[PDB]
Amino acid sequence: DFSAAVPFLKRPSNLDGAYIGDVGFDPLGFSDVFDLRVLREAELKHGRFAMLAVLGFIVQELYTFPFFPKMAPVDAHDYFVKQGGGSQIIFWISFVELFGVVALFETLQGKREPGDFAFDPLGLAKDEATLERYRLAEVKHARLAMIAIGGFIHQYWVTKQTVLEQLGNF
């Protein structure tokens, strides 16, 4: 009848809690129009990019490879635009995203979970129960990292200080 997250809003019809991390939060009604599978594909893909990027920031201030010049991550974006390594990374992301297009076609055809690439080399998921717990954690971390990366880049744009140095100063 109503949403778990927003008490005064009604729970969206397409949000039945089947996807982990669901709390009924969809006021603008994007699930009433679009396929939720595609939207969870997009949520997990944006979030995984954001999580890799927030670790990307933190490690890039802490360390940089000796063959690459020491510099700030947004300056790293521009340097690797002009150097060629950005095009390398874009090509290899695009190459993986080809099979991601195939994977999304498998999701639309009903035969794949929206974020599952069966990528468990280290076997951390043991049974279904821990997989569900990890999955809820993954979506929560994905959403939190999407907000966090926007903060890290916007704070750098306003104050030309890196995230670790901005915590260190002020």
């Binding site: 005064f8 009604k10 006021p27 603008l28």
Partner: protein, 129 residues
């Protein structure tokens, strides 16, 4: 149903939804209550490091008003979902009390802002002078 003194002389309720009208009245009430409590508060005390209408103009340059607008706008977008859904589809005493106090605050703030246009003074300053 709360705060019903039988006072609808122009009969607005006949030609607009009582739910949309009540949402507008209650939202105006609350906003006005915060505004009236705010007017007196600015004169009584100032948050560290920090005019009825001119201070708004100063704040937009400082971005203080702009940050408040963005966050209130996000809550309001969720509130727009709530208003559309409501239109589509102790505590009793407190609802009447909230409506009456909010109506008094609507008039209260209205008085404070016209007092500011007249003497250029805050509501506490109006009592002081």
């Amino acid at each position: 149903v709360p705060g019903d003194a039988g006072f609808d002389p122009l009969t607005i309720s006949a030609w607009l939804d009582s739910r949309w009208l009540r949402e507008a009245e209650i939202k105006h009430c609350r906003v006005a209550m915060l505004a009236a409590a705010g007017c007196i508060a600015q004169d009584i005390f100032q948050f560290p490091g920090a005019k009825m209408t001119a201070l708004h103009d100063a704040a937009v340059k400082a971005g203080s008003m702009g940050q408040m607008l963005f966050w209130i706008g996000f809550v309001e977008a969720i509130s727009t979902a709530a208003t559309i859904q409501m239109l589509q589809g102790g505590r009793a005493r407190m609802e009447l009390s909230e409506i009456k106090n909010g109506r008094l605050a609507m008039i209260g703030f209205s008085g404070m802002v016209h007092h500011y246009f007249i003497t250029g003074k805050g509501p506490i300053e109006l009592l002081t002078s």
